[PDB]
Design a protein around this ligand. Structure first.
Ligand code: NI
Length: 151
């Protein structure tokens, strides 16, 4: 495995929309493996490929141990219900936290490492993390949705 450098705001790669993954190959699997440990070593709960300099629709989230690691390739949100307001941060903006409103429940369609399509339902913090990472894949950063930063 390799500890990948996490790209910090500012950097253009962070605002670049990502291409869909077309080849589900060994390089993709290594990217995901490296991203997950890099993310945890940095005490993060989500990480998207553009944050490690790769413009592909690939992200991973890992909040609870029971749930565990969820790798998302070419994810799309099929349904959103309810709202939740709370603090949000990002490994690409060290120490920056702001209040962001996100859907509370989401239904997500995405592919795994082999290209198989799965359906995932999430709520609360996990749903917040997933929404934040999917935004990265479209070149959107959380600062664009912060309503207020904390003192
Ligand atoms: Ni982020």
């Amino acid at each position: 495995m390799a500890v990948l450098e996490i790209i910090k705001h500012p950097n253009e790669v962070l605002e670049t929309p990502c291409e869909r993954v077309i080849n589900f190959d060994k390089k993709l699997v290594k990217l995901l493996k490296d991203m997950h440990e890099t993310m945890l070593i940095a005490d993060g709960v989500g990480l998207a490929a553009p944050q490690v300099g790769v413009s592909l629709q690939v992200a991973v989230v890992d909040v609870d141990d029971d749930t565990g690691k969820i790798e998302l390739i070419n994810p799309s949100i099929l349904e959103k219900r309810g709202e939740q307001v709370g603090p949000e941060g990002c490994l690409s903006f060290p120490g920056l936290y702001g209040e962001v409103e996100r859907a509370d429940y989401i239904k997500v369609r995405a592919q795994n490492r082999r290209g198989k399509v799965f359906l995932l339902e999430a709520e609360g913090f996990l749903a917040r993390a997933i929404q934040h990472e999917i935004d990265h894949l479209h070149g959107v950063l959380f600062t664009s949705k912060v309503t207020r930063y904390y003192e």
